[PDB]
């Protein structure tokens, strides 16, 4: 499974020392490109993309997002006038990209949002822009009259796939790498309750299975997971907690399942 995702944001209040327009690209959930309204240029974020792309590619990419920046700049005023709003903090969000699944076939998407709520979504099957809100009917009329659907469905099904197929090939080692996590368990006694915490430090890829084991048997009672949180170097972190009786700290163990480990690693105090 391989995914390509391009997300854009048009802000009214960023606010101090921050750009109003931010555009970023993703390959299998990894940041590879960045664009901001202050610098006005598309920059590489990973080593595999910069070593495999020329300046002529980035000059072409900069021109595209520069035109997209001015369209989203106009969208902030058009939507404010339509909703009859005067000033304040308003946002325009764009979600575009394609996904390659295990037959499976191709899944393409192009959807927008205003003030964190769904506005419009493109349906490649019917070749029409679906309006989610009653204020999205004037958007549907102007978008379909422009004839964008004819070129957008060809992009999401062929061009988007063609770009993603080579991006995976460029960083095949950078995406297929394995990093072993540093697992450490801790115990803290509160108001007559012993809270045990298990943390995994710097693992790659993102999928991980972390569970608790009391006296050899897996116990999910009073268990809380903080999900998968990213680090500044590309690796991932996870935090799991369990509420137990005081003095029963030695009974509990942390079961960690990852691609880097051939067998599940059991960790104790």
């Amino acid at each position: 499974l391989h995914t390509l995702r391009y997300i854009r944001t048009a802000m009214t209040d960023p606010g101090p020392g921050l750009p109003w327009f931010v555009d970023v690209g993703y390959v299998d959930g990894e940041l590879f490109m960045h664009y901001n309204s202050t610098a006005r240029r598309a920059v590489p974020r990973t080593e595999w993309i910069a070593a495999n792309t020329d300046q002529q590619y980035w000059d072409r990419e900069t021109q595209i997002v520069q035109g997209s920046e001015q369209i989203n700049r106009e969208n902030l005023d058009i939507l404010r006038r339509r909703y009859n709003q005067t000033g304040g903090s308003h946002t325009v969000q764009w979600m575009s990209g394609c996904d390659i699944l295990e037959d499976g076939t191709i899944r393409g998407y192009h959807q927008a949002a205003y003030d964190g709520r769904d506005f419009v979504a493109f349906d490649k099957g019917t070749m029409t822009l679906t309006a989610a809100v009653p204020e999205a009917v004037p958007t549907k009329r102007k978008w379909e009259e422009g004839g964008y659907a004819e070129g957008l469905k060809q992009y999401l099904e062929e061009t988007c796939v063609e770009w993603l197929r080579r991006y995976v090939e460029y960083g095949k080692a950078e995406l297929g790498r394995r990093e072993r996590p540093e697992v450490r368990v801790w115990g803290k006694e509160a108001d007559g309750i012993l809270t045990l915490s298990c943390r995994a430090h710097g693992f790659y890829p993102r999928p991980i299975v972390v569970s608790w084991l009391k006296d050899g048997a897996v116990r999910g009672q009073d268990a809380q997971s903080g999900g998968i949180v990213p680090n500044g170097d590309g690796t991932y972190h996870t935090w799991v907690t369990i509420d137990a009786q005081p003095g029963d700290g030695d009974k509990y163990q942390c079961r960690v399942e990852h691609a880097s480990l051939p067998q599940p690693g059991l960790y104790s105090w």
């Binding site: 854009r8 690209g25 595209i64 989203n72 969208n75 764009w94 422009g146 964008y148 957008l152």
Partner: peptide, 11 residues
């Protein structure tokens, strides 16, 4: 790998 047609973002 952005789409050439940036007009598809019009609202």
């Amino acid at each position: 790998g952005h789409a050439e047609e940036y007009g598809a973002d019009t609202l």
